[PDB]
């Protein structure tokens, strides 16, 4: 643990500084160090962790897609052989991406999930587990592809089951979980109808519960509801 000698509070402070400086790799390393202190994470700390790794893996995914597109065009009919380099570099980025996913899943399994008893923490971490298995699934091609997909599905389903029993339909964690599980159905599981049904039902149940909210909670919930509607517009 390269961060083992730094105070937990100092790691959290430096994660916040790294965020302001748009140094997301640093932010992720700081938050990994904080997790490895072994204490549970507060709500703010959980979101620092997720923001950091989402930005890191997001850049990797964007790069992988560029390289995968180039590689597919280099293997088309009539294309000129450019050598192993495109595949090699796509593989390099892919391996680094898988490594980030393995790291995040590792933090969740040792030992964030098993200590998370409140719905807002447990649903948050199970959503993250689904998300990072989904990123593995985006690049998976071999014997374990179906098991990787099912690992994502299983995590998202447990998170959904808890969220429906323990959170109001406008809870932003519940909403973001449903948004992302819907995308899993559409893009990973080849289940566009399930994706569309989930997005619609989530939006409608949230709409019916907005009346209970303060102005600030309303803003948080309607922001994610607009993303559900954006996806529905893309898909219908």
């Amino acid at each position: 643990g390269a961060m083992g000698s730094m105070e937990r509070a100092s790691l959290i402070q430096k994660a916040k500084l790294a965020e302001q400086a748009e140094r997301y790799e640093d932010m992720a390393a700081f938050m990994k160090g904080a997790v490895e202190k072994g204490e549970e994470l507060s709500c703010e700390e959980r979101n620092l962790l997720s923001v950091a790794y989402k930005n890191v893996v997001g850049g990797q995914r964007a790069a992988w897609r560029v390289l995968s597109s180039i590689e597919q065009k280099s293997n088309e009919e009539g294309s000129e052989e450019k050598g192993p380099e495109v595949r090699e570099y796509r593989e390099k980025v892919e391996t680094e991406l898988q490594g980030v996913c393995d790291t995040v899943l590792g933090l969740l399994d040792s030992h964030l999930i098993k200590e998370a008893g409140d719905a807002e923490s447990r649903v948050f971490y199970l959503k993250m587990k689904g998300d990072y298995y989904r990123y593995l699934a985006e690049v998976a091609t071999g014997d374990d592809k179906k098991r990787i997909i099912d690992s994502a599905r299983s995590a998202y389903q447990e998170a959904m089951d808890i969220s429906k029993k323990e959170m109001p339909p406008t809870n932003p964690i519940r909403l973001g979980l449903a948004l992302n599980f819907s995308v899993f159905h559409y893009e990973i599981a080849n289940s566009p109808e399930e994706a569309i049904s989930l997005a619609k039902t989530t939006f409608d149940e949230a709409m019916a519960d907005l009346h209970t909210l303060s102005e600030d909670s309303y803003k948080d919930s309607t922001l994610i509801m607009q993303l559900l509607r954006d996806n529905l517009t893309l898909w219908t």
Binding site: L179, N180, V183
Partner: peptide, 5 residues
Amino acid sequence: FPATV
């Protein structure tokens, strides 16, 4: 790509 958070 579709929206996720």
